[PDB]
Amino acid sequence: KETAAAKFERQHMDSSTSAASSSNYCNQMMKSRNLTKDRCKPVNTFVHESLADVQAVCSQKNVACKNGQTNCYQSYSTMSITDCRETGSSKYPNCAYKTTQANKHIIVACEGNPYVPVHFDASV
């Protein structure tokens, strides 16, 4: 089945764009990445950086995850991110999301060999 590392890339990477380009980004992306298949994932962050710059955070600042886990890392630098949050108009199967574009530091949980990101914890 899909690895946790490949699931991270499918849910959270969008190297192909520098920022979300319209208020429709999120509905388009959330859909095409298969995130609205069984239900509407409520919150999801997209990261508009290179995969290597995102994999490198697993060697930057070590911070506790929100849940208390010790395998989280905060990026030394701000990154271009898009947060997608479900709207009051959202009704499965028609998920509807609000697109917010920002530059913030990200916090991911890493695991494995090579040690790469497996979960997006937060943006700061």
Swiss-Prot record:
Effect of H119A: Loss of activity
Cellular component terms (Gene Ontology): extracellular region
Catalytic center residues: H12 (proton acceptor), H119 (proton donor)
Subcellular location(s) per record: Secreted
A single BP term in Gene Ontology: defense response to Gram-positive bacterium
Tissue: Pancreas.
Catalytic EC class: lyase
Family: Belongs to the pancreatic ribonuclease family.
Name under which the protein is recorded: Ribonuclease pancreatic
Source organism: Bos taurus
Full protein: residues contained: 27 to 150 of 150
